[PDB]
Amino acid sequence: AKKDQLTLRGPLYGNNRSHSKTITRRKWNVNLQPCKVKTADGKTTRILVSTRTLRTLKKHNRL
């Protein structure tokens, strides 16, 4: 689905309220962006990365 290529995190599906507080079925999609990685033994093409994982890989030097 619309999930990143590094970890598994299902999109959020729940209920949203209006100005009159009307229950509606609403969706939140995880923040994913295409990013290029470089590491040993191939696996260097573009993948989908979540910003939450993006910061961690940025500080942990996952390239």
Next chain:
Amino acid sequence: MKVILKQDVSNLGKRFDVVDVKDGYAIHFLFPKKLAAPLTKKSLQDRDLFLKKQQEHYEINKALSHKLKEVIEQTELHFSLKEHNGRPYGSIITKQIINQAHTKGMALQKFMFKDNVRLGFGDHEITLHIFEDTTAVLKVKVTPD
């Protein structure tokens, strides 16, 4: 994800110290020539080790630069082009010279060639700014046919 430059000076001189403010990918992680190491050591205790590492990198950079200059100015590059009865119809791209360098046993990376693509036939000479103080000049002959 360090805060110190790694052996390549950026835009108008900043000294080799802990000064590179981290926007995250602006130019620090944009350049793949930067450090990837923990932070607890890289405050003051690993500073002397980093100075020794920078000196080693500087000396090997000078040695390799001189070697590449020597082997380039002794062995000029050659290719061939298809000619429009005297007018250059073939095209030459930096990919070809990168391939030639890689085949000749001296790989040149993708992060130092910033020149425009070459368009023309005949003998060409280009001074490539691969290095700031010890840059090289390459001569290429393309056979017209």
Next chain:
RNA sequence: GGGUAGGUGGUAAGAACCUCAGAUCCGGAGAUUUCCGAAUGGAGCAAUCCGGUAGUUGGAAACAGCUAUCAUUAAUUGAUGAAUAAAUAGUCAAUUAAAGCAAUACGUGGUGAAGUGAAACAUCUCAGUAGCCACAGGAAAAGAAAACGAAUGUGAUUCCGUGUGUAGUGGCGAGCGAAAGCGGAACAGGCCAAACUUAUCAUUAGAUAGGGGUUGUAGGGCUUGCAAUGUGGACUUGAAAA
């Protein structure tokens, strides 16, 4: 093995049979088990066709009989290996897995309606109802205090009554329903990474395999001693017995 004198499943009296030199039947243990069917060589319109290979045989050969092999995916391994020199990707080869079906019963996770009521209805209610998907199990999940809680209180968790319809929550409307404690069934706590160190990674590994270690009646790593000669398991197969 028990194991006997008639038996050969039923519309079939029969006919033809055999039989106490121990059948049949019954219970185990196997073999056999056409084809389809997750279906697995390709397809197919289900029980069909066309097939590839490695051999065997008749034949001069084609051809025709007899066998077994021939899906995809994931992991591991080896080799070839373009853009791109190299390496990859990819390709080929070999090994291992579930792959599927079903008990309308559960359990877990995810997705996710309605009408009913408020004699109206949108907040709400039924309701995370039904339903849909995935998973494994015969039980599952939950489980070891960042627990509770306001007392010199207890010391994994799960389930049953009580607490109790309490304190409360809700266009404070309909409605909704505790948290401890008690009486109880049952009641085992363990295992990792880190500092610290040893051998192996061109030993820059920041990884691999070891000693150690599972923390608040604080404890471990560290320097430095005396001891202790064991017990129970969340636990190995051998041997016998019941």
Next chain:
RNA sequence: CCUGAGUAGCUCGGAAAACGUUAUUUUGAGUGAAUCUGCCCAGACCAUUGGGUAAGCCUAAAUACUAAUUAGUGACCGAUA
């Protein structure tokens, strides 16, 4: 020397909790502490006081049900059932 970091809290909406979002746990987006004199809890919050040591993993035990096999049973109906 050490005690589990893009970690907890926090902001914008939520979900689970008697619970309609309120202490408590969690996240779709952002955020960025602590080092044992620590840190968390004690239905906002502080001081005081008391309790506790997570952010890695596992755990049969009581409990729900018999599609199915065996032996027995029914103040169960007796072929418009």
Next chain:
RNA sequence: GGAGAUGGGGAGCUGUAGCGAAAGCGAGUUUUAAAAGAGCGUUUGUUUGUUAUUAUAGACCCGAAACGGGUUGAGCUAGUCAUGAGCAGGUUGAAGGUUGAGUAACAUCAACUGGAGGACCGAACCGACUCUCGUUGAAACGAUAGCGGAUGACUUGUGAUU
């Protein structure tokens, strides 16, 4: 424990003093300055069996168009797609081109080719425009008699989709 009464297990519930929302007080409480007044008080039992009623569970029962989720559906039929077949028979003789006159060249006219037309009549075929008949018919849509189209936006078969 014959899945038995029962025995054990006193955890809790009623009444035993109440007043109120409460700090608390107490045969008094609260309202009040009140010892003023007023209110509530001033113990009058518990457990079962039973009947009826009431409360939720479908709750005397039958009844709808309802609503939501899932599922089969292009062979009826609508449209489309690729691909065959067919249109009898009879009519008309366009444009265009040719020749000649003609005109400076054109144009125009007379004769010829020519068979074209969402041109005509009219079987097959397609559809159904009308009267009668039938309306528990032979038929859950028909029958005689006529009707229109009937060479094109013509009909239809095959297989496929939505």
Next chain:
RNA sequence: UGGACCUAAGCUGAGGCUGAAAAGCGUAGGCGAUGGACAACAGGUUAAUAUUCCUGUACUUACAGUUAGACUGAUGGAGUG
């Protein structure tokens, strides 16, 4: 009339892409006549069918050997169809 010979619309789909899940899309690929290619006619028989049984007359594509002759030649390219 067909298949082992070939496709049109179409169908499926390794990979791969998208998508809460199931799943949807789609490439090489493989199927898919209503068509194309493709070699049989006359007569007779049976209660019953028949260019399939028989009689006469035929032909084709195949395999091997043999004779004779020649340089032949695709999983590719062109014409054809």
Next chain:
RNA sequence: GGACUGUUUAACUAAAACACAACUCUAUGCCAAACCGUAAGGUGAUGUAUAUGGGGUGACACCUGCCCAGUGCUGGAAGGU
């Protein structure tokens, strides 16, 4: 009355309805504009403004008067919000 060849409410009804060539207007310069979905992907379109989508009318002859007050649509950047 409508231009007609025609589409028709199977199984009550064929037109003064629709349709049509045509006329008029708006929008659209390539990942066109639009549309399906959610998304991949797909038509438009293996198209390029003499074209397409949408709106309105409906051979041909001749005309289509006024008004942007209100609504819409576009432009607008000063000022209030």
Next chain:
RNA sequence: AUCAGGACAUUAUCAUGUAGAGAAUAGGUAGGAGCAAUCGAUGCAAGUUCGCUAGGACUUGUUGAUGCGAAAGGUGGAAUACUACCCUUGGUUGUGUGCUGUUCUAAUUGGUAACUGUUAUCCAGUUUCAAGACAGUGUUAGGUGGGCAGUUUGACUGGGG
């Protein structure tokens, strides 16, 4: 990332203030009756700036011991220098910032073109090209939005509305 200008602000920088009078160019808190002197006068051109339309804080080319009418002389509701505090305006070294316009790609997009996988309209990798911090995507919060969802549309009525 980078380039430039403007701003919103200010450290520091000096200038900057006339009702009538005071013989004068007076904004409010003060010790206060002396001090300016190579922290080199007066006179000579006047300027940075103020500009009221009259001059001022400072000064250089010159200057060499002059004095200060603004201590003291006296004045006004505010009275003088040396100096501690603070108001209006103009600049103003300096930074924090976004905003306006941009330059570049190396993030990123592509249904630009090419090579290989693969002798494949897809797809994978690579290169190229056009773009390029934008678009798209995620969230939050706006504006618009009968395309769609859910509902509502009272009662008496000497038939109904």
Next chain:
RNA sequence: AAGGGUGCUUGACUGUGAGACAUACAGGUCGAACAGGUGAGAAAUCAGGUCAUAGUGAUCCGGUGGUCCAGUAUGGAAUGG
């Protein structure tokens, strides 16, 4: 006279309240009498809005002042009654 004007002022009080009124309820009507402390007038006694019968909508919810009130381990605060 319940009217006219004159004068003191402001009972157009606080806490109530037996007893009655008429009624499903919500309610609504008068009111003896007492306590405090008042105004009037010497006192008498009157004054619990007018000569009376019309001259308003509960219950939430949210808000203001004060409160002998509570204060999630303690204090406050916060949050409340």
